[PDB]
């Protein structure tokens, strides 16, 4: 039963994250989230996550370092429940999240001027999963 609970919590944090995006991408991520039934959900989450990773890196090179922060924080508050659900449907669904989320933050860290410690752990967690 708790699958539905964790799905609404992932639906909530991702919505709050998407609200920090431009309206062009905030439309597709929002339609993919709400037109995916209940078993493509994790696929839509990984789709919305891949579009978000695509979005936040462009704004990070622009100077929108505050929107990327506010957006990723909402990605963070649902990162554990998304991995648990993705692990419930398949070990590959777990691994897809890091390759999105881990790769997202890594490029976000590799863009901001002036911690390599976090970049370091993110790379190995990617390697250890690969």
């Amino acid at each position: 039963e708790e699958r539905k609970e964790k799905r609404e919590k992932v639906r909530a944090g991702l919505k709050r994250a998407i609200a920090e995006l431009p309206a062009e991408v905030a439309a597709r991520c929002l339609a993919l989230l709400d037109d995916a039934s209940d078993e493509e959900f994790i696929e839509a989450v990984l789709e919305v996550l891949e579009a978000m990773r695509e979005a936040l890196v462009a704004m990070a090179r622009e100077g929108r370092l505050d929107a990327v922060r506010r957006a990723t924080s909402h990605i963070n508050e649902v990162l554990v429940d998304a991995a648990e659900l993705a692990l419930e449907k398949g070990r590959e669904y777990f691994r897809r999240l890091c390759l999105i989320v881990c790769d997202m933050m890594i490029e976000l860290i590799r863009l901001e001027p002036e911690l390599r410690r976090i970049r370091e752990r993110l790379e190995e967690i990617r390697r250890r999963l690969e």
Binding site: I75, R91, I118
Partner: peptide
């Protein structure tokens, strides 16, 4: 098992948002 990596990712991810730009 794998759930630890998830908790490690929020931990690492929450630290990224803390000490990002400023």
């Amino acid at each position: 098992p794998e759930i630890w990596i998830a908790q490690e990712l929020r931990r690492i991810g929450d630290e990224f948002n803390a000490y990002y730009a400023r």
